[PDB]
Design an enzyme around this catalytic site. Structure first.
Site, PDB file in Angstrom:
ATOM      1  CB  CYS B  66      10.936  65.050  41.461  1.00  0.00           C
ATOM      2  SG  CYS B  66      10.419  63.510  40.746  1.00  0.00           S
ATOM      3  NE  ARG B  69      15.019  64.030  43.364  1.00  0.00           N
ATOM      4  CZ  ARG B  69      15.765  64.710  44.226  1.00  0.00           C
ATOM      5  NH1 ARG B  69      16.758  65.470  43.783  1.00  0.00           N
ATOM      6  NH2 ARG B  69      15.515  64.637  45.525  1.00  0.00           N
ATOM      7  CD1 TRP B 233       5.004  56.511  37.807  1.00  0.00           C
ATOM      8  CD2 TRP B 233       5.872  55.768  35.883  1.00  0.00           C
ATOM      9  NE1 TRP B 233       6.212  55.926  38.093  1.00  0.00           N
ATOM     10  CE2 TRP B 233       6.769  55.459  36.933  1.00  0.00           C
ATOM     11  CE3 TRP B 233       6.211  55.393  34.578  1.00  0.00           C
ATOM     12  CZ2 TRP B 233       7.977  54.801  36.714  1.00  0.00           C
ATOM     13  CZ3 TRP B 233       7.413  54.739  34.363  1.00  0.00           C
ATOM     14  CH2 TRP B 233       8.280  54.447  35.429  1.00  0.00           C
ATOM     15  CD  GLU B 238       1.666  63.098  41.571  1.00  0.00           C
ATOM     16  OE1 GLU B 238       1.605  64.017  40.723  1.00  0.00           O
ATOM     17  OE2 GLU B 238       2.301  62.032  41.390  1.00  0.00           O
TER      18      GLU B 238
END
Ligand code: HEM
Ligand code: HEM
Ligand SMILES: NC(=[NH2+])NCCC[C@H](N)C(=O)O
Ligand SMILES: NC(=[NH2+])NCCC[C@H](N)C(=O)O
Lengths: 359, 358
Positions: B66, B69, B233, B238
């Site tokens: 991720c 972070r 969010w 993506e």
């Protein structure tokens, strides 16, 4: 001894798949492993044939996990430069490789082996390569050439200190240290960057060389270690336009590109960085063809790499690779490669790195 | 073996756990004890509001995959280890959506459920589109084909379009997966349109706002909360780089390329690329014209880099998965791509877990 114990094994497994893919026989394998055991003993190492280095070279390229363009692995022009023992001699094979490799345009994928075990040892990462300098204020040239240049300089060499000074060949033979030779101004073919839709793209006064002849790499085949064996294929747009030209630490050209092309560098959410990348790579792919230099875009490579995967299976071999090094540095999610995983196991023969003498 | 293994994990946890928040051994020392007996009587134990909250944020922080972070310590947690009815487990799910969607200003939230599989949310994401394989053709998200097939098996039926809202299917206690369609009012959807290309909105593409992954079980102090939805969010890529670009996903590259009048007859023209950009700008533009939280990769990787700084200056090691961190477009324009990471799993962390329908 345990060098002749291992080396023997490496040799034995080489000849086995080697001769076997060649569709040789089972007798001539032992016949050959025999000559090799007898020789590795009476002399301490053995010597290859030119179907051994030849096909062995092509096998090393096939086995290169970090390479996307392995399709044409069989079409490698191998040159036996082993009989070279003098510094003069070495140099010429190196001036030749450049030539033949360039081929005044339609670049030829070629490798030139040299006396192994380190009897010859070329220092340059790439035969043709731009110099690196760090002056009072400002980093001039190719940042990833710094150390080397600072080594050439130390040996009496001096450049013009332009962002594109062609470095010199500098090899070390039989012992001592090295010697260099400026590399012919008319031997280094270059390509000026121009964009087909933005004429100002040349005020950016950018240019790059045609053939990337990597050479600071060692080539192991059957246990023998060819510390000096230049090789080259042809560039891939992204290479020059997505890395050499767009990285912060390198020529960091993206912003100027964006600017001249009217975009605003103020906000990232406009993706000016990205738009630039497109044009900056378009410019490169475009440029090269216009000059006649053999080039390939990242989409075709992947596609040809995919053909390589198909072909490799139709042959019975499994395919090995390195995802982190295959994904094209641009729109990597549009190549099949990105949606699949690969086994990074290195199968010999292969290419390896080696400590840099100038560090 | 199994229960001793738990204390090992349970201890390792309260220590570092208490360490950071800034308290005092007199406790780690004393409250790490009641967990020794409570495991000798029942067979496990229960956390504290203070523990799973932070401990969940730790998991996020420990997400090797991720890029977001930089805000681990702002994860709005939500307790719910007291739900045991199917009707209950549903309203909480409904909560998560509302609170998280927050009418737009997306709130990074998670909702922990009772552990050891007493609750099982089936959906990958709470809000996600269905997939169908029609005679000639395939409709929707090829990714949710399998799961959808399941939903239809349980009696659910879809209007078979490119963007049908899958139903929430949960399992509780032990059997019978039940499902209930989500109140249309709760799913906020952003229509993709282009700031310069007026003809973009004609591609009639849209996408939801909150990616609430819901099928990972986040271990913490040896406690497996098989159910524990979390979100953030979106990041432009993506959506406009993967979900809308892959040939198996919505294979939207060639039409945008066509509509945007480029030449799709040659790759040496980088038509896919020009298209990727314009499709991505199309997302970021849209999500903003709707007032929905969303970050771009350049800004995102920037922040991740800050997370790196703050992790070291705070004397912690940063772990990651380079292959997941680098964005799908222009990965070599982010510090990420150019350095190496440690894909070592530091727990508490989120994990994968078999799909009940496959
Ligand atoms: C046909 C043209 C060729 C193409 C399109 C091609 C393309 C590539 C690309 C894109 C990379 C990544 C470069 C980077 O990220 O810096 C690479 C790496 C590599 N290629 Fe190929 N290649 C070609 C020919 C060759 C040949 C002829 C050989 C060997 C005889 C070869 C050996 C390798 C090796 C060993 C690497 C690794 C470089 C390293 O580790 O630093 N390539 N190639
Ligand atoms: C601040 C907003 C956030 C952003 C920008 C962000 C972004 C991302 C991105 C882009 C991925 C890759 C997604 C993919 O390729 O499928 C990812 C994966 C992941 N992130 Fe985040 N994230 C955020 C918040 C969160 C939160 C709140 C949690 C946990 C509490 C979390 C947990 C994870 C996990 C566990 C994965 C792995 C998903 C998988 O393996 O499929 N993220 N994140
Ligand atoms: N296509 C190739 N043979 N590439 C070899 C590596 C060249 C290196 N990436 C460069 O830009 O100089
Ligand atoms: N930013 C996130 N938390 N994303 C979670 C994964 C969502 C997934 N990438 C999707 O596009 O649906």
């Amino acid at each position: 001894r345990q060098h002749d114990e291992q080396l023997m094994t490496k040799a034995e497994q080489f000849i086995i798949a080697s001769y076997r893919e060649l569709g040789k026989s089972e007798q001539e394998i032992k016949r050959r492993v025999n000559e090799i055991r007898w020789e590795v003993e009476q002399t301490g190492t053995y010597r290859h044939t030119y179907e051994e280095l030849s096909y062995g070279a092509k096998m090393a390229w096939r086995h290169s996990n970090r390479c996307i363009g392995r399709l044409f692995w069989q079409s490698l022009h191998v040159i036996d430069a082993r009989e070279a023992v003098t510094e003069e001699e070495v140099f010429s094979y190196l001036f030749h490789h450049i030539e033949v490799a360039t081929n005044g345009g339609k670049i030829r994928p070629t490798i030139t082996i040299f006396r192994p075990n380190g009897e010859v040892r070329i220092w340059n990462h790439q035969l043709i390569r731009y110099a690196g300098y760090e002056t009072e204020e400002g980093i001039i040239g190719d940042s990833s050439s710094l150390t080397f240049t600072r080594a050439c300089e130390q040996l009496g060499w001096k450049g013009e200190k332009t962002p594109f000074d062609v470095l010199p060949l500098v090899i070390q033979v039989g012992g001592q240290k090295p010697v260099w030779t400026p590399i012919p101004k008319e031997l280094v073919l270059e390509v000026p960057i121009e964009h087909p839709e933005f004429p100002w793209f040349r005020d950016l006064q950018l240019k790059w060389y045609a053939v990337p002849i990597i050479s600071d790499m060692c080539l192991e085949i059957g246990g023998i270690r060819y510390m000096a064996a230049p090789f080259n294929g042809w560039y891939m747009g992204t290479e020059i336009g997505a890395r050499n030209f767009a990285d912060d630490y390198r020529y960091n050209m993206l912003p100027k590109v964006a600017s001249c092309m009217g975009l605003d560098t103020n906000s990232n959410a406009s993706l000016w960085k990205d738009k630039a990348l497109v044009e900056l790579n378009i410019a490169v792919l475009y440029s090269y063809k216009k000059a006649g230099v053999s080039i390939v875009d990242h989409h075709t490579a992947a596609r040809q790499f995919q053909l390589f995967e198909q072909q490799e299976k139709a042959a019975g071999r499994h395919v090995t690779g390195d995802w982190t090094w295959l994904i094209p540095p641009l729109s990597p999610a549009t190549t099949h490669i990105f949606h699949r995983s690969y086994d990074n196991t290195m199968m010999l023969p292969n290419f390896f790195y080696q400590d840099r003498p100038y560090e």
